[PDB]
Amino acid sequence: VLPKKEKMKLRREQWLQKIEAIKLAEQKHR
Amino acid sequence: IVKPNGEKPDEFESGISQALLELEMNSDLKAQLRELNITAAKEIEVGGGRKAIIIFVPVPQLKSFQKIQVRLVRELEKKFSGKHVVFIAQRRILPKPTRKSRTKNKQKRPRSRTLTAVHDAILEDLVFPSEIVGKRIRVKLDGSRLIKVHLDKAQQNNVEHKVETFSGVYKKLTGKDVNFEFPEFQ
Amino acid sequence: GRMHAPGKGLSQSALPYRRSVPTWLKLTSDDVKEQIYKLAKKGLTPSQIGVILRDSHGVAQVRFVTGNKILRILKSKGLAPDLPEDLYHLIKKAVAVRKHLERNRKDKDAKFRLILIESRIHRLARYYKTKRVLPPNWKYESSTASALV
Amino acid sequence: VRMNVLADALKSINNAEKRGKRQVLIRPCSKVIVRFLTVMMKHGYIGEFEIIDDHRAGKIVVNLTGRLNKCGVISPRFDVQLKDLEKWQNNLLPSRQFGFIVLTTSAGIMDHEEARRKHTGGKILGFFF
Amino acid sequence: PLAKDLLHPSPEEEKRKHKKKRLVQSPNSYFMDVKCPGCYKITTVFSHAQTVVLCVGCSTVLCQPTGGKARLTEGCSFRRKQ
RNA sequence: AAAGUUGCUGCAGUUAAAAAGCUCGUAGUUGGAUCUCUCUCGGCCGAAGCGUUUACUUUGAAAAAAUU
């Protein structure tokens, strides 16, 4: 289908995106 | 009647000894109460100014006291005013053996002398006509535990009004929050 | 799973939460202990004593009534054997299988199962040597095996 | 056979959380398990739990809430000197804000921030984010 | 689906489960008291008894051991106890 | 170094290199739940027994420069 390199990049990028989203959500609580 | 381990009788257990003396003079509890003895007594507050009586009795005669529980409870409630009396054995909490203690530990402390064992035995001794058929510990958001006791439903009709006194006595002499419950089925 | 078999079965006994003696049991602790004494004088293993007391007399758990287990009750009086009952039954089974093997030399299945049995014997003997029930000079030997029974 | 019951508890909770369950049963109970669950409770991750007490090792029913992404054990219980602690979180946490190394120290079972405040080290038990 | 109280199972489910796999395990057997047809005496017999049970006075076989529950002699009367 | 092609962090072993014919079969590795400080002699203190032993963690002493 598509090489595993950009699948790994997409997964780690979306994971850091959830990290940033939950960081902003938890910062909003203060 | 009263044999304190500190051997300093106060007027409270003096009046209690007089009460058991009056019952052993008159009532049918003559072949039991003469041989038996108590050790201490205490009168505490529960439920917004409701006084309750705790009778500390020795352990090895405890079972004999277990045979004559409800008669003594009813007759001592008749003798005094509207009160509540519970029978709880006198137990010794030996401290946990740390690496800094006196040299009396040539022998280990028995498991029945620990905090949890004595606390569970006190919870067992406090409610005689019902039996503890289950126990839960609900651990709240604050980090504080709340013990819930599931009792025998066959004997709810004698202890349904003492659950507040049970919780108050256990809070006074244990410090832990306990609620009492009756399951619908076993 | 099983220690030498490929089985993994769940079946066992399940004790109830009520450790209290039931109200309908009128036997005192010393009466139960006297029954234990006469049953042991009849020549019974503590397992057999527990089964008989559960079935016929209605004593559900001897430790819940008397406060001590059967082997400790027999030990305090002194009516307890030198080697424990599970090791006795294992050694008896090993003796029986070895007799069958000396009569029947072609039974390689019996050889394999005898190896299983005496390995179980070695594990239990190691445990009993570690907790001082057996003397440290005790050792299971093939010819001495029938002498223990 | 069953060794390290804390690993079993944390795996059960994680597998329950990934299926979007609300409530999970844990057997057997332990002191270390209860302290770990209290640590996750105080930070608002696993809500509420109650200990069912039979006369064996008990069980725990835990009310899952939804915030927890991954709770995990670290086996073996590596010693964590206070310097090495920093390295550890960069190995286990996806950020330097959230996630928790849980240490057992002589001051108790706690997280890495509280262990840094109390200025002590200990054995690493897990992490949750 | 995905929404039930594990802390409070109903009697039918907890009865239906295996005796070890309940919320708190509990046995399925019971002690029952038996009257011999040829006498009046009470004998307390385990439901899943493995030994053949003789009357203490009449020596009549009350129950025969089977794979599970004991098989009472016909004529005997039994009552669930406790 | 890229390299996670030596993998403790951190690889793999159906079909690509790879799991032993199969099980009993010591050492080594791993092992369920549980337990909340004082006695003598000298000026409240100093000496003494430590309290079962450790492992673990923190503190302190002490440890050449140059190099970093």
Side-chain angles (χ1 to χ4, degrees), chain D residues 24-41:
Chain D
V24 65
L25 189 151
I26 296 285
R27 49 166 288 267
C29 179
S30 183
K31 267 163 34 164
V32 179
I33 293 178
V34 164
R35 295 291 329 140
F36 207 105
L37 293 181
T38 309
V39 170
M40 301 199 258
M41 180 146 66

Side-chain angles (χ1 to χ4, degrees), chain B residues 65-82:
Chain B
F65 264 82
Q66 297 294 321
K67 290 191 285 187
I68 55 167
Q69 175 83 41
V70 289
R71 293 131 300 280
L72 276 296
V73 167
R74 174 191 41 260
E75 276 153 301
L76 273 296
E77 286 215 37
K78 291 218 186 273
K79 180 68 65 67
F80 298 113
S81 65

Side-chain angles (χ1 to χ4, degrees), chain B residues 6-176:
Chain B
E7 61 268 13
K8 324 162 291 283
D10 206 348
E11 60 89 17
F12 293 100
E13 57 261 20
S14 296
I16 299 310
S17 50
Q18 293 284 339
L20 280 73
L21 265 176
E22 293 156 46
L23 276 296
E24 194 274 331
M25 294 298 103
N26 301 315
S27 181
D28 215 359
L29 309 164
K30 267 157 183 312
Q32 302 96 299
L33 282 181
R34 195 260 303 159
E35 310 68 9
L36 296 179
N37 296 295
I38 75 166
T39 53
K42 189 177 178 181
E43 315 190 2
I44 70 172
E45 187 192 8
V46 62
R50 283 279 304 104
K51 324 312 291 213
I53 313 302
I54 308 168
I55 303 299
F56 292 88
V57 308
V59 183
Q61 293 179 356
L62 182 63
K63 200 67 60 165
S64 65
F65 264 82
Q66 297 294 321
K67 290 191 285 187
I68 55 167
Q69 175 83 41
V70 289
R71 293 131 300 280
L72 276 296
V73 167
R74 174 191 41 260
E75 276 153 301
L76 273 296
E77 286 215 37
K78 291 218 186 273
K79 180 68 65 67
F80 298 113
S81 65
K83 291 297 161 93
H84 275 299
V85 61
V86 297
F87 282 0
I88 291 160
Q90 183 94 330
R91 265 69 170 267
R92 181 94 45 72
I93 298 279
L94 283 186
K96 192 182 164 193
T98 183
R99 40 176 68 80
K100 292 186 286 185
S101 54
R102 205 177 185 203
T103 184
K104 71 177 76 65
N105 308 321
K106 289 178 180 59
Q107 60 189 0
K108 47 198 291 191
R109 65 159 179 177
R111 295 290 211 99
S112 57
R113 269 80 175 173
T114 58
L115 192 85
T116 63
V118 161
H119 278 212
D120 292 348
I122 278 170
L123 188 50
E124 182 204 348
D125 265 356
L126 174 70
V127 293
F128 176 62
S130 296
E131 292 220 332
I132 296 99
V133 304
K135 186 186 287 184
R136 314 282 210 245
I137 302 174
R138 183 87 173 186
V139 181
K140 300 284 201 203
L141 293 174
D142 294 329
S144 62
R145 316 190 152 204
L146 188 147
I147 300 169
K148 295 196 290 292
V149 171
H150 294 127
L151 289 174
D152 203 342
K153 84 190 163 214
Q155 263 282 199
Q156 65 182 357
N157 44 7
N158 290 138
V159 305
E160 87 277 13
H161 60 289
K162 321 178 98 175
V163 287
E164 311 85 358
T165 62
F166 291 146
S167 174
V169 162
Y170 210 77
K171 182 140 189 192
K172 184 48 157 35
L173 61 84
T174 287
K176 296 199 262 222

Side-chain angles (χ1 to χ4, degrees), chain C residues 46-115:
Chain C
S47 304
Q48 284 161 343
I49 292 157
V51 183
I52 281 181
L53 285 168
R54 174 183 27 87
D55 297 324
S56 72
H57 306 95
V59 176
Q61 271 290 119
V62 187
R63 187 180 74 258
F64 289 175
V65 169
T66 61
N68 291 316
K69 37 185 65 66
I70 303 189
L71 190 80
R72 281 173 186 171
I73 283 157
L74 286 191
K75 187 173 312 303
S76 311
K77 182 61 68 69
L79 301 203
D82 50 353
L83 73 165
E85 55 253 60
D86 51 355
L87 195 48
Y88 193 99
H89 291 105
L90 270 163
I91 287 170
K92 182 63 198 194
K93 188 193 290 147
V95 162
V97 173
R98 184 170 289 304
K99 194 209 318 299
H100 167 85
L101 264 181
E102 61 76 14
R103 195 192 50 180
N104 279 296
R105 202 168 92 173
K106 297 297 293 296
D107 211 338
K108 301 172 182 174
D109 190 32
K111 185 182 314 189
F112 181 76
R113 298 276 177 247
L114 182 61
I115 297 169

